[PDB]
Amino acid sequence: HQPSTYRLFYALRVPADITAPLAEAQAKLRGNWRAVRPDQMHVTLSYLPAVPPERVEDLKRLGTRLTQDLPPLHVNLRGTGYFPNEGSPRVWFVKTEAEGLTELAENLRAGIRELGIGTDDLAFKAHITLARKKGPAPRLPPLIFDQSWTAPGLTLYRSILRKTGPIYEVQSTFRFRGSASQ
Numbered sequence: 001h002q003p004s005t006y007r008l009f010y011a012l013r014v015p016a017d018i019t020a021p022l023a024e025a026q027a028k029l030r031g032n033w034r035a036v037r038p039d040q041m042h043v044t045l046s047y048l049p050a051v052p053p054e055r056v057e058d059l060k061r062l063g064t065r066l067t068q069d070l071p072p073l074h075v076n077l078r079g080t081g082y083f084p085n086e087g088s089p090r091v092w093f094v095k096t097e098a099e100g101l102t103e104l105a106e107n108l109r110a111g112i113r114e115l116g117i118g119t120d121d122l123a124f125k126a127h128i129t130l131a132r133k134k135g136p137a138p139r140l141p142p143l144i145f146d147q148s149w150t151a152p153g154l155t156l157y158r159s160i161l162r163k164t165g166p167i168y169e170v171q172s173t174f175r176f177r178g179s180a181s182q
Contacts, residue, residue, distance in 0.1 A: 012154065032134065071178050098126070
C-alpha cells in the first residue's frame with residue numbers, strides 16, 4: 001500500500017437555528033431518500049479526496065490567508081433543488097447565497113491547485129445537502145426558506161468512514177477577520 005492520505009474538505013458550518021428548520025423540512029422525505037443528519041449539514045467549498053498528511057499545514061496557511069480580509073459572511077437560505085439537474089435525482093439540497101461566497105470558493109480552489117493538491121469538485125453552486133438517494137422515491141414539493149445566519153469562519157474538516165455513514169472532524173477553523181467597510 002501507498003502512504004496514507006486524508007479526505008478533507010473546506011466548508012461553512014451551519015448553526016442550530018438553521019439546521020432546525022432544515023430538519024423539519026426533512027420530515028417530508030419518503031421512500032429511498034436518506035436524510036442528512038443535522039450534525040453533517042455544511043456548505044462545502046472544496047473537496048480534497050486524498051491529501052498527504054504533510055500537506056495539511058499548507059492547507060491551514062491557505063485557509064488563514066484567504067479569510068484574513070473578509071468579514072463574517074451573511075449566508076441566506078433560498079429554495080430547494082436536485083442533483084443531477086435531470087433524470088433520477090440523487091441529492092436534494094437547499095441553495096445558499098452570500099456576498100463573497102463564490103469568490104472565496106474560487107480563490108480556495110485556485111489556491112489548492114497552486115499547492116499541487118488534488119480536488120474533486122463540480123462547478124461551484126453553494127448549497128446544503130438535505131438528502132441522498134439511489135433508486136426511486138416520491139419527489140418532494142418545492143420549498144423556500146427565509147432564514148439567514150452570520151458565518152464567523154471557514155472550517156477545514158476531515159472525513160472518516162463509519163458504519164452509520166461518514167463522520168466529520170474539525171481540523172482547523174479560520175476566522176473571517178476583515179470588514180466590508182474598511
